[PDB]
Amino acid sequence: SNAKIGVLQFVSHPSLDLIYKGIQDGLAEEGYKDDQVKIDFMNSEGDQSKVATMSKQLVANGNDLVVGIATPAAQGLASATKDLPVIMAAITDPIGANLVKDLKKPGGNVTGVSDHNPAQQQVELIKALTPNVKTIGALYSSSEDNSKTQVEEFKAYAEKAGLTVETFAVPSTNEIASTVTVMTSKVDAIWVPIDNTIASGFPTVVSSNQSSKKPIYPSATAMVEVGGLASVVIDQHDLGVATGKMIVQVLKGAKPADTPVNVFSTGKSVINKKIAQELGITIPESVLKEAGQVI
């Protein structure tokens, strides 16, 4: 009765907006819509100062639980409260983010949905689609715990497949353009993990790379659709619906400490056909046939 939730979205990028749409759809499917739920929505605009101030407000405002969309938002909320339920919406590495003890028994007030990056499949796609690529530049933020883990895992798989990965971390969106310029003289392809900083500034990557014409393998449909070549990605709307359903489970009494994390890990490829063709890339018949989405 009297359901009230607070939602902190870390920043505006299209993937997070679609996750939030999914949250609303999942709530509505369970009857939590219109007069049956009050949602207090806030967006920290990628600003850690806003994360702190907004988290403090959301956990002290009579909400039954709070929801953090993306790792920095969930971390802000989990720091601000140890007793109010905190639901993760698409946190790539909950253990490495210090949000849960393990996936089975989170052990505190935090549970939710995790989008694991399919690094092995991305490496396989790079090898199949651009067999001339030898060195990959990993562009990501040093501010994001999610990306630290993904870069480690990707590098391990890439090395096994005979590729080299050089890292180009940025502390913020401000350093993207200049970093792209530097890295594109050093690497054959740009890879971007599930990274909120780069996702929020992705058109800057595309515009900065117009002169270099290196393929970009960025870990979101929303990035591939505005100039990336291809990736292997998890369905964002599915992440949001699953988060909505876990919010309802917790409203109905589930204890976060004993509620397993819902991990998505396999995804499907997404291929930007015109970007490939413009780069003079052949899309192998099998690659095109197995594609989850063709743009």
Ligand X SMILES: N[C@@H](Cc1c[nH]c2ccccc12)C(=O)O
**Interaction residues for ligand X, span 32-51 (CB under 6 A):** none
**Nearest distance from residue 3's CB to ligand X, in Å?**
25
d(CA 74, CA 55): 9
Residue of 137, 195, 246, 269 interacting with ligand X (CB under 6 A)? 195
Under the criterion CB under 6 A, does residue 196 sit at the interface with ligand X? yes
**Nearest distance from residue 110's CB to ligand X, in Å?**
13
For residue 7, give Cα distances in angstroms to 18, 33, 86, 193, 207. Answer: 14, 15, 10, 24, 33
Question: What's CA 199's distance to the chain center, in Å?
Answer: 8
x/- track of binding to ligand X for residues 66-105 (CB under 6 A): ----xx------------------xxx-------------
Measured from the CB atom, the residue of 37 and 220 that comes closer to ligand X is 220
User: 270 and 292 in contact (C-beta within 8 Å)?
Assistant: yes
Under the criterion CB under 6 A, does residue 139 sit at the interface with ligand X? no
Backbone dihedral angles phi then psi of residue 293, each to the nearest 5 degrees = -145, 140
**Interaction residues for ligand X, span 144-173 (CB under 6 A):** 146
**Nearest distance from residue 86's CB to ligand X, in Å?**
14
Residue 1: count of CB within 10 angstroms of its CB: 5
Give the full edge-to-edge strand order of the sheet including 268-271: 230-233, 268-271, 293-294
**Site of interaction with ligand X (CB under 6 A):** 15, 70-71, 90-92, 115, 146, 194-196, 199, 220, 236
